[PDB]
Design a protein around this nucleic acid. Structure first.
Lengths: 78, 72
DNA sequence: CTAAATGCAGTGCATTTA
DNA sequence: GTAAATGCACTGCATTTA
């Protein structure tokens, strides 16, 4: 119900390299690490949602704090 | 797999307006009231919940984004 | 967050049908 | 003979279900 660490390493290793596979690209990976490609297909989409979601989350949790800290500076000036 | 009936989801969208964080008791009736496994019921809300914070902060994002840039 | 999966456009090319 | 259709894949993403 989850994937192998041996496996998942090579997943993330490829996505930094080639974050968008063709079918052909997808198939060969599976044969290398004993998985189904539609699985492989699915993951590659979900990793893409991951980067979208986190790039937003970090930013929001950050800018809220950054726009918060700057405001305190403005009042110390006034 | 198997998605959820429109009857289900419509009642969902209708109730989600009311108590977007519902307790076991009400979860228990709704689960029964709507031919559901309450885990499923418990689940969908968690996601339904999770979606909105993301959707809201994205608008929080885009609105805080255009304001800062346009000033320059 | 994961793992699995669906729904809807849209895109390209090869083959029918009109 | 040609142009428009249709059948078949694939892509890509956002959303849903557990």
């Amino acid at each position: 119900h989850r994937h192998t660490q041996r496996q998942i390493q090579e997943l993330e290793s490829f996505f930094k390299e080639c974050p968008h596979p063709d079918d052909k690209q997808r198939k060969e990976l599976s044969r290398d690490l004993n998985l189904e490609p539609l699985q492989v297909k699915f993951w590659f989409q979900n990793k893409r949602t991951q980067m979208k979601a986190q790039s937003e989350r970090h930013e929001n949790q950050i800018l809220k704090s950054d726009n918060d800290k700057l405001r305190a500076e403005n009042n110390r000036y006034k």
